[PDB]
Design a protein around this ligand. Structure first.
Ligand code: NAI
Ligand code: FMN
Ligand code: SF4
Ligand code: SF4
Ligand code: SF4
Ligand code: SF4
Ligand code: SF4
Ligand code: FES
Ligand code: FES
Lengths: 216, 209, 457, 125, 78, 112, 114, 121
C-alpha cells in the first residue's frame, strides 16, 4: 500500500530542526535557478531529493523546511512527497534491496531471487533487518527488462542474477565491501545477445557525413 | 459573443467558451454530476456528466468540454445511459453501506442519482470486501466519516480557492488517496462550515447537529 | 520483404557502446557536423521534411509528429508573448520498454541536438528532459553530455553562433509511471502531483507553466537530426507506407537470448525472433503467445502471430498495437493468467486515483484476477469481468484506464479455455464457489472472513 | 381586486381571510444537493401564529398545535396563478421573488493560465 | 391477472329478483372453488414481486450486503 | 417485455374511433387523448348534454352504463375543477371517459 | 401483534435512530428523537409508539435495516385507561427483553422470506 | 429470480427499464385533426415538399383552415378511408379482447333445467 497519514513520534516530529548542509545549500540554489523565478515551486521534487540525501529519509521536518524555502503551504509539499514512491517517509538503513517483480522479471526467476533474499534475511519485503543494515522492497519495472533477473541496492542495478549468486552478492554487501559495480557476474556487456554481437561488427563507425541530403 | 449549438434537438445560445454543462443547464437539459459546482473551479474527475458530441469519437466530460459553433449534443443516447450506469457502478463499489446511519440520508446526491441513473442492483460481491479509510479530526465543527468520500475534491477546491485555507488537500495515490491534512490539523477558517454543504455525500457533516 | 537493415543504415552505432559516448566519439559518428546550417534553415523546412518523412509519435500514440509540431505554431504565434516551451518524455516506464534507456545512455548528444532542432521547428526557448528517477546513472551520463554541449557552445544562449537561444535542463521524476502521460508529465514538472489534466485544452494551447508546450518521446526526437541530415525520402524507404523508418525493438521474456536491436518496421515476428533472440525457448511449437508492445497491449495468439507484420497497421488489424515495440514472449511452460494478473496489479499500483472509473476499477480488476488465478470463480464471471473492463475503457481522463482494460480483454479473447480449466480445478479440487468467491461455510467471524481461501489476502 | 369577507363560497372560517398572511415563493435550490427539481413550482403556505403554532404535551412529549394550516401548502404552476387564487379567496399575501445564479463563463483551461508575476496562490487539483 | 389461464363459467340469471341473485352467488361459490383448485395445480416457480428494485424493495439478504440494494431500500421506504 | 406493447393495435383503433367522433360532432368535441386503452373526450360544459346523448344512444357507441362522476381540483387553471364522466358499453365491451370544466360559481348541466 | 424493541446478543440496542420506521408508518404512530450517545454511538433518546393510532401493518418492521422494531405475536395486552397504550422507549425495550425467545422463533421461521 | 433478469453479465438496466419507457399521453385538438385531414399523415402523406409543405403546416397551425371547412373540402376517398371505414360505415367502439360467449346446457350446467340461472362460458 501507500501510507498516507503521518503520526508524530519523538523521532520524525515537526519540532526537530532540519537544515541543509552548506554544500547541499549551494546545490539547492543551483537547482532552483533552472526554473523560472516566479515558478520556483517546481523545484520541490529535487529539493526533497536533496533532503532525503542529507538525512536518511524524507521526514516531516524535511518537508516543512522545503515548504518554507519555496514559500509553499506545507500541504502541497505533503501531497508531492506522498504521491511519489521514491520518497521514503520511514527511516531505513544502508542498503535498500529492490526486487523487480513485473512479468518479464518473473518469467526469468525473480521468485527465486526473492526467495534467496528472504532466506538470507528472514524479513518480509516491507520489513528491515534488526541491524537496520538491509531493507527489502518489492518494486515494479525498473526499466531493465532485457536482463529479466535483476535488482537494485541503493542506486546501482544488478542484473542477470542467480539465486546462488544473489546470496553471494548479499554477503559481500554484509561484510561492507562492494563486490562489483558491473551489473552481473560478467556474461555480457549489458545489452547484447549472450552469443556475442550479431551486428555492428565494424572496427570503426561510419560517419554520418558520408551521406548528405544536399539540402544543407 | 454568444454562439449557437443544439442539445437534444433543442436550440440553445450561450456565451462562447462556456462549458457544455452550462449550455445544458441553460437549455433545460438535466445532466448528473458530482465534482462540478457553479462556484468552484472545474475538475472533471467524477466522470458522471459524460455526453456524446458528434465530432468526438468517445463521450466527453460535459463540465469541462468547451462549447463551439454548430455543436450537436445528445444526452439521451444508449451509450450515454450505459456510461452513467458504468460510472455509478464503479462509484458505489467501495461506498460503505451507511445510509441508515449517514446524516446525509434522504438528501444525498449519491442516493438520488443512483436511483435515477444507476442500475437497480449491484454486481460487486467480493470476499476480500471493500476499502476502508481512517477518520480524521479536523476540529469541533465538521465531523468526518471518510469511508463515504467519493473524492470529488469540492472540499479541497473550496478550502484552497474560496476561503484561502490551504491545509486541506489530497495525500497518497490511487486507491489510498485520502482527503485530509496528512497530519493532525484543524480546518481553521470562519467559512469552514460550507464544506458541509459542498460535500455531496456524508463524509463531511455538521457535528453539533 | 521487410527487415535485415544494413549496418550502414542503422541510425545510432552506439547501441552496443563499443565506440563510446564521448563528444569526440559523437563527432566521429558525425553528430553536430551541420547544426549551424540546419538551424539557419527555416523552421518550415524542418517541419516539412518531417511531413515528407511521415514521422509518427513512437512513444505509442502515433499521432503524426509533423502536424503535432505544426500546432505549436498558430498563425498569430507572435501575439502570445512569453516563453514557448518544449518537453521531452524521457519517463519510459512501460513494462517491457527499455529502448529509451539505450537512447539516453548510448547516444546522449543526439537527444540534445534533436531538442534544439525540434525547438527551432517549434520556436521553443528552452527544453526540459523528464527522466524517471530510478534512472540515476544515465541521468548522470546525460548531464555530463549536456555539460559538454554547453562548454562547446553548441547549446546555450548562442547556439552554434546562429543567434538562436536555447537552454536544456534535466528534471527527474520520482517513481510514478503515470507521469509518462504528457499532461501528468507537465503537472509533475510544474511542481504538483502528477495527475493528468483533461484534454481539451491540448498541451499546445495550454501547456507547461501555462505556456505553449509539446511533449515528445526521446527516440523520436533522437532520430530527428539523422533524419534531417540523411533526408526524408531515405527514411521513408524503410518500412511500408505510413509505417516507415526503423525502430528500437527491445525483446524480453522466454526467448533464448534476450536482446535490444534496431530494425526496419514491418518485419515479420518469426524472422525477428529467430534472427535476433535465438528463437523461443523450446522452439516455435513451445510458444503460447506474444505481447507486441509493452504490457498495455492485448496479447497475440500463437496461430495468428505467425504471419503478422510489425507496422502499426497490421497489429491494429489483429487488434493490438506496437506501443513501444516492447515484445514479451511467453512459452507454454508459463501461466498466462499469472502474467495478466501481475499486469493488473501493476495498473492498480500505477493509477493516480483522480477519476472514479480508473480509481475504483483497477482494484476491482485486481480482485477478480486473483480469483481467476486460483480459479475461485464461476464461469459467468468471465463475461462479468469483460463488462467490468468496458466500464473503464472509454470514460477515464487519460489513457491509463484504456491500458488497464486492454490486457484483460486480450486474455479473455484468447485464453478463456485456460480460465475454464482452472475453474474446474478449483471446483473439483477445493469446493463449489458462488459469485465473488464465497463458499458454503464462508462466513464472517470476530472481524475476519473464515471458511474460504480469500485470494489476495 | 380582492374578494371581501362573506361572499366567499368556500365556507372556510372568516379568520382565515381576516388575520392570516400567506406567502408565495419558489423553493430555493437546496445547498445540500445539486438537483433542482423542486424549485420550479410556486408554493403557497401560511405564516405562523405565535400562540397556536406548537407546544409540548406534558405526558408523552408530543408537538401539540392549534393552527389548522401549519401543514398545508399549495402548489401552483406560475406566480400569476397563485396571486389570482389568493385574491379569489381573500388571503393577504406576500411575494418573495426568487434568486438565481448569475451566469459566468467557466473554462477548465483557466486552471493552468501562465502567471507573469508572483503566484497569488498554488492551485492544487 | 391469471383469469385467462384458468377455466371457469359465469352464471347469469333471467328474472332479476332476489332469488336469481342468490342462485348466482351460490354458483359463484362453485366457480371460485374450481379456480382455486386450478391454481393449486398450476402454481409456477419464480419471483412473486417485480424484479426491479426501483419499484419493490430488495430481499433483506441483499439489503445487508449490497450498496445499491441498501440505497434503493432506503429511498423506497423514505 | 414492455407491457405497453400489447396495446398498440388497440391504440390505433381507439385513435380511428376518436377521429370519427370528432368529425361527427365538430360543434362539441374540443379534443381527445388516448393512453393505452382509455379514450378521453374534452368538451365544454354546454356540450355535455348533446355529447352524452350521442354516446348513450348512437348505435356504434351505446354507452348505456354510467360508471362514475367526479371532479379534480386544479388550482392553477382559471376553471378549477374538471368534471370526469366514465361510461361503459356492455354491448361493445368498451369504455369511454368524458371531461368538462367548471368553477366555484359556474355550474355544469346535470345528466340525471 | 404488539411491538417490541430488540437488542444485540451483547445487549446493545439494535435501533440506531435511522428513522425509516418513522417515515414509512402509514398512521404516523411513531415519534423518535436521537443524538450522539456519550460513547459516540448514534442512538435514540425517545422512541414512542401510540398504540391507539397504530394499524398494526408491519411496515415499520419491514423497513428497519437492523431488525430493531418487531411485532410480537402477543395480542393480550388490553388496558383499562388510554395512557398505558402510549408506549415509550422503556416499555418497548422491556417488551423486547420479555419476548425475545418467541421473537427468535418467529425470526428463525420467517427471515428467509423477508 | 428469473433469467435473464438475474444475469450478472449481459443485462444493462436501461434495456429493461420499463417505467421510464412509458407511453406518453397523446393529445389531439381540432387543429391537429385538421392537419391530419388536409396534409395527410406520416404513414400516407398528402403534402408537397420544400417551403410549400412547411407553410401548409404553418397556416393550418395558425388557423387558416377550420375543422368544418376541412371536412367539406375532404374528398370521398379520404372520408371513407380515414374517418369512416372503407365501406363507409362508422367504426364500432373498440374492444381490447373480444369475448365470444357460449352457453353450457345439459349435464355440464351448474343448475338443472328448472332453475332460473344459466351457465355462460
Ligand atoms: N511510451 C510509453 O512508455 C507508453 C506510451 N503509451 C502509448 O500512449 C498512447 C496513448 O497516449 P495518449 O496521450 O492518450 O494519446 P493521444 O491519441 O491522445 O495522442 C497524444 C498526443 O496527441 C496530440 N494531439 C492530438 N490531437 C491534437 C490536437 N487537436 N491538437 C494538438 N495536439 C493534439 C497531443 O498533443 C498529445 O501529446 C497509446 O497508444 C500507448 O501505446 C502508453 C503506455 C506506455
Ligand atoms: C499512462 C501513460 C504513460 C505514458 N508514458 C509515456 C512514456 O513513458 N514515454 C512517452 O514518450 N510517452 C508516454 N505516454 C504517451 C505520451 O503521454 C504522449 O501521448 C505521446 O505518446 C508522447 O509524444 P510522442 O510519442 O508523439 O513523441 C504515456 C501515456 C500514458 C497514458
Ligand atoms: S453518503 Fe449518501 S449514499 Fe453514502 S451512506 Fe450516506 S446517505 Fe447513503
Ligand atoms: S470529503 Fe466530500 S467534498 Fe471532500 S473529496 Fe470527499 S466527497 Fe468530495
Ligand atoms: S485514468 Fe487513472 S491514471 Fe488516468 S487520471 Fe484517471 S485515475 Fe489517474
Ligand atoms: S405497524 Fe404500521 S402503523 Fe404500527 S408502527 Fe409499524 S408501520 Fe406504523
Ligand atoms: S427503522 Fe429500526 S433502526 Fe431505524 S429508527 Fe426505526 S427502529 Fe430504529
Ligand atoms: S521487468 Fe524487471 S526491470 Fe522490467
Ligand atoms: S461533473 Fe463533469 S466529470 Fe465530474
Amino acid at each position: 500500500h501507500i501510507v498516507s497519514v503521518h503520526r508524530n513520534t519523538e523521532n520524525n516530529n515537526p519540532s526537530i530542526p532540519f537544515e541543509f548542509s552548506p554544500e547541499n545549500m549551494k546545490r539547492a540554489e543551483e537547482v532552483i535557478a533552472k526554473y523560472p523565478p516566479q515558478y520556483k515551486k517546481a523545484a520541490v521534487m529535487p529539493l526533497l531529493d536533496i533532503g532525503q540525501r542529507q538525512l536518511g529519509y524524507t521526514s516531516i521536518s524535511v518537508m516543512n523546511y522545503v515548504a518554507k524555502l519555496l514559500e509553499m503551504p506545507p500541504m502541497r509539499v505533503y501531497e508531492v512527497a506522498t504521491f511519489y514512491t521514491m520518497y521514503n517517509r520511514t527511516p531505513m538503513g544502508r542498503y535498500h534491496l529492490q526486487i523487480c517483480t513485473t512479468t518479464p522479471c518473473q518469467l526469468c526467476g525473480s521468485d527465486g531471487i526473492m526467495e534467496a533474499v528472504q532466506n538470507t534475511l528472514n524479513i518480509k519485503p516491507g520489513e528491515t533487518t534488526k541491524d537496520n543494515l538491509f531493507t527489502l522492497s518489492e518494486v515494479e519495472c525498473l526499466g531493465a527488462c532485457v536482463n529479466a533477473p535483476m535488482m537494485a541496492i541503493n542506486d546501482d542495478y544488478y542484473e542477470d542474477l542467480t539465486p546462488e549468486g544473489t546470496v553471494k552478492l548479499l554477503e559481500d554487501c554484509k561484510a561492507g565491501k562492494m563486490p562489483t559495480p558491473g551489473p552481473e557476474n560478467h556474461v555480457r556487456r549489458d545489452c547484447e545477445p549472450a552469443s556475442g554481437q550479431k551486428v555492428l561488427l565494424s572496427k570503426e563507425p561510419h560517419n554520418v557525413a558520408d551521406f548528405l541530403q544536399e539540402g544543407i | 459573443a454568444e454562439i449557437e449549438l443544439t442539445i437534444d434537438g433543442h436550440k440553445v445560445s450561450i456565451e462562447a467558451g462556456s462549458a457544455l454543462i452550462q449550455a445544458c443547464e441553460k437549455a433545460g437539459v438535466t445532466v448528473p454530476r458530482y465534482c462540478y459546482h457553479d462556484k468552484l473551479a472545474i475538475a472533471g474527475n467524477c466522470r458522471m456528466c459524460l455526453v456524446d458530441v458528434e465530432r468526438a469519437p468517445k463521450p466527453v466530460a460535459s463540465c469541462a468540454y468547451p462549447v463551439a459553433p454548430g455543436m450537436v449534443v445528445r444526452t439521451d443516447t444508449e451509450r450515454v445511459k450505459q456510461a452513467r450506469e458504468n460510472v455509478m457502478e464503479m462509484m458505489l463499489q467501495n461506498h460503505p453501506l451507511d445510509c441508515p446511519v449517514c446524516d446525509q440520508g434522504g438528501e444525498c446526491d449519491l442516493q438520488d442519482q443512483s436511483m435515477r441513473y444507476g442500475r437497480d442492483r449491484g454486481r460487486f460481491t467480493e470476499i476480500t470486501g471493500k476499502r476502508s479509510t481512517e477518520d480524521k479530526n479536523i476540529g469541533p465543527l465538521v465531523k468526518t466519516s471518510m469511508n463515504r468520500c467519493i473524492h470529488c475534491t469540492r472540499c479541497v477546491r473550496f478550502a484552497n480557492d474560496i476561503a484561502g485555507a490551504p491545509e486541506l488537500g489530497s495525500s497518497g495515490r490511487g486507491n489510498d488517496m485520502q482527503i485530509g491534512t496528512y497530519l493532525e490539523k484543524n480546518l481553521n477558517t470562519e467559512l469552514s462550515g460550507n464544506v458541509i454543504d459542498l460535500c455531496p455525500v456524508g463524509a463531511l457533516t455538521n457535528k453539533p447537529y | 520483404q521487410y527487415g535485415g537493415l544494413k549496418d550502414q543504415d542503422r541510425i545510432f552505432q552506439n547501441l552496443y557502446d563499443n565506440y563510446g559516448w564521448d563528444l569526440a566519439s559523437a563527432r566521429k559518428q558525425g553528430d553536430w557536423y551541420k547544426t549551424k546550417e540546419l538551424i539557419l534553415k527555416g523552421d518550415t523546412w524542418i517541419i516539412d521534411e518531417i511531413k515528407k518523412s511521415g514521422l509518427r509519435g513512437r512513444g505509442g500514440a502515433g499521432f503524426p509528429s509533423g502536424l503535432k509540431w505544426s500546432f505549436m505554431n498558430p498563425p498569430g504565434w507572435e501575439k502570445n508573448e512569453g516563453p514557448r516551451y518544449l518537453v521531452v518524455n524521457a519517463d519510459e516506464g512501460e513494462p517491457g520498454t527499455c529502448k529509451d534507456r539505450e537512447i539516453m545512455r548510448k547516444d546522449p548528444h543526439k537527444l540534445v541536438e534533436g531538442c534544439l532542432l525540434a525547438g527551432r521547428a517549434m520556436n521553443a526557448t528552452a527544453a526540459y528532459i523528464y527522466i524517471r528517477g530510478e534512472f540515476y546513472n544515465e541521468a548522470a551520463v546525460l548531464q555530463t553530455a549536456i555539460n559538454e554541449a554547453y562548454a562547446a557552445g553548441l547549446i546555450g544562449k548562442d547556439a552554434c553562433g546562429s543567434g538562436y537561444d536555447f537552454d536544456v535542463y534535466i528534471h527527474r521524476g520520482m517513481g510514478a509511471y503515470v507521469c509518462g502521460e504528457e499532461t501528468s508529465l507537465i503537472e509533475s514538472l510544474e511542481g504538483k502531483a502528477g495527475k493528468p489534466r483533461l484534454k481539451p485544452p491540448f498541451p499546445a494551447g495550454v501547456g507547461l507553466f501555462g505556456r505553449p508546450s509539446t511533449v515528445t518521446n526521446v527516440e523520436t526526437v533522437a532520430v530527428a537530426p539523422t533524419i534531417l541530415r540523411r533526408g526524408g525520402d531515405w527514411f521513408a524507404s524503410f518500412g511500408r507506407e505510413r509505417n516507415s523508418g526503423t525502430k528500437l525493438f527491445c525483446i524480453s521474456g522466454n526467448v533464448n537470448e534476450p536482446c535490444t536491436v534496431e530494425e526496419e518496421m514491418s518485419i515479420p515476428l518469426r524472422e525477428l525472433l529467430e534472427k535476433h533472440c535465438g528463437g523461443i525457448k523450446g522452439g516455435w511449437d513451445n510458444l503460447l503467445g506474444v505481447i507486441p508492445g509493452g504490457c498495455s497491449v492485448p496479447i497475440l495468439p500463437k496461430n495468428i502471430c505467425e504471419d503478422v507484420l510489425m507496422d502499426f497497421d497490421a497489429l491494429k488489424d489483429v487488434q493490438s498495437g506496437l506501443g513501444t515495440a516492447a515484445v514479451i514472449v511467453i512459452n507454454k511452460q508459463q501461466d498466462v493468467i499469472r502474467a495478466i494478473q501481475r499486469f493488473a496489479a501493476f495498473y492498480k499500483h500505477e493509477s493516480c486515483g483522480q477519476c472514479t472509473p480508473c480509481r475504483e476499477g483497477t482494484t476491482w480488476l485486481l480482485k477478480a484476477m486473483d480469483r481467476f488465478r486460483t480459479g475461485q470463480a464461476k464461469e459467468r464471471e468471465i463475461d462479468m469481468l469483460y463488462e467490468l473492463t468496458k466500464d473503464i475503457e472509454g470514460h477515464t481522463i487519460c489513457a491509463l484506464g484504456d491500458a488497464a482494460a486492454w490486457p484483460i480483454q486480450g486474455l479473455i479473447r484468447n485464453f478463456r479455455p485456460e480460465m475454464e480449466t482452472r475453474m474446474k480445478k478449483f471446483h473439483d479440487e477445493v469446493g463449489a464457489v458462488s459469485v465473488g468467491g464465497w463458499m458454503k461455510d464462508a462466513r464472517v467471524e470476530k472481524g475476519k472472513v473464515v471458511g474460504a481461501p480469500l485470494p489476495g489476502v | 381586486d380582492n374578494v371581501p369577507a362573506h361572499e366567499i363560497v368556500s365556507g372556510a372560517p372568516a379568520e382565515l381571510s381576516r388575520n392570516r398572511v400567506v406567502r408565495i415563493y419558489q423553493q430555493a435550490k437546496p445547498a445540500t444537493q445539486s438537483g433542482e427539481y423542486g424549485t420550479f413550482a410556486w408554493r403557497l403556505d401560511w405564516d405562523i401564529v405565535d400562540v397556536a403554532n406548537r407546544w409540548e404535551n406534558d405526558l408523552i412529549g408530543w408537538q401539540s398545535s392549534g393552527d389548522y394550516m401549519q401543514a398545508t401548502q399549495m402548489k401552483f404552476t406560475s406566480k400569476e396563478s397563485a396571486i389570482k387564487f389568493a385574491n379569489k379567496q381573500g388571503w393577504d399575501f406576500y411575494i418573495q421573488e426568487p434568486h438565481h445564479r448569475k451566469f459566468r463563463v467557466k473554462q477548465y483551461a483557466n486552471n493552468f493560465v501562465h502567471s507573469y508575476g508572483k503566484l497569488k496562490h498554488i492551485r492544487t487539483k | 391477472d391469471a383469469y385467462d389461464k384458468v377455466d371457469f363459467d359465469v352464471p347469469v340469471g333471467m328474472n332479476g329478483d332476489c332469488y336469481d341473485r342468490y342462485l348466482i352467488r351460490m354458483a359463484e361459490f362453485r366457480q371460485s372453488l374450481r379456480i382455486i383448485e386450478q391454481c393449486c395445480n398450476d402454481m409456477p416457480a419464480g419471483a412473486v414481486k417485480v424484479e426491479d428494485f426501483k419499484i419493490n424493495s430488495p430481499p433483506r439478504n441483499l439489503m445487508k450486503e449490497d450498496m445499491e440494494a441498501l440505497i434503493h431500500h432506503f429511498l423506497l421506504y423514505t | 417485455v414492455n407491457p405497453a406493447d400489447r396495446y398498440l393495435q388497440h391504440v390505433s383503433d381507439l385513435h380511428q374511433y376518436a377521429k370519427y367522433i370528432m368529425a361527427a360532432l365538430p360543434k362539441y368535441i374540443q379534443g381527445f387523448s388516448v393512453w393505452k386503452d382509455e379514450l378521453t373526450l374534452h368538451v365544454a360544459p354546454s356540450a355535455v348534454i348533446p355529447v352524452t346523448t350521442f354516446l348513450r344512444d348512437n348505435t356504434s357507441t351505446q354507452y348505456k352504463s354510467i360508471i362514475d362522476i367526479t371532479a379534480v381540483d386544479y388550482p392553477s387553471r382559471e376553471n378549477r375543477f374538471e368534471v370526469v364522466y366514465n361510461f361503459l358499453s356492455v354491448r361493445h365491451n368498451s369504455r369511454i371517459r368524458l371531461k368538462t370544466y367548471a368553477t366555484e360559481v359556474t355550474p355544469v348541466p346535470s345528466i340525471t | 401483534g404488539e411491538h417490541a424493541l430488540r437488542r444485540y446478543p451483547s445487549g446493545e440496542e439494535r435501533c440506531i435512530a435511522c428513522k425509516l420506521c418513522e417515515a414509512i408508518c402509514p398512521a404516523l404512530a411513531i415519534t423518535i428523537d436521537a443524538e450522539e450517545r456519550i460513547d459516540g454511538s448514534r442512538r435514540t433518546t425517545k422512541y414512542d409508539i401510540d398504540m391507539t393510532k397504530c394499524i398494526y401493518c408491519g411496515y415499520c418492521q419491514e423497513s428497519c435495516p437492523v431488525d430493531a422494531i418487531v411485532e410480537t405475536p402477543n395480542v393480550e395486552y388490553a388496558t383499562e385507561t388510554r395512557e398505558e397504550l402510549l408506549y415509550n422507549k422503556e416499555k418497548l425495550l422491556a417488551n423486547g427483553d420479555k419476548w425475545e425467545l418467541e421473537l427468535q422463533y418467529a425470526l428463525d421461521a420467517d427471515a428467509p422470506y423477508r | 429470480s428469473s433469467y435473464p433478469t438475474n444475469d450478472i453479465a449481459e443485462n444493462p438496466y436501461w434495456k429493461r427499464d420499463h417505467r421510464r419507457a412509458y407511453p406518453q399521453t397523446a393529445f389531439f385538438d381540432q387543429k391537429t385533426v385538421t392537419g391530419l385531414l388536409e396534409l395527410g399523415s406520416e404513414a400516407t402523406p398528402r403534402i408537397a415538399d420544400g417551403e410549400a409543405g412547411t407553410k401548409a403546416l404553418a397556416n393550418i397551425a395558425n388557423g387558416g383552415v377550420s375543422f368544418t371547412q376541412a371536412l367539406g373540402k375532404s374528398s370521398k376517398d379520404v372520408i371513407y378511408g380515414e374517418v369512416l371505414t372503407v365501406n363507409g360505415l362508422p367504426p364500432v367502439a373498440p374492444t381490447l379482447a373480444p369475448k365470444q360467449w357460449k352457453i353450457i346446457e345439459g349435464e355440464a350446467a351448474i343448475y338443472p333445467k328448472g332453475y332460473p340461472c344459466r351457465t355462460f362460458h
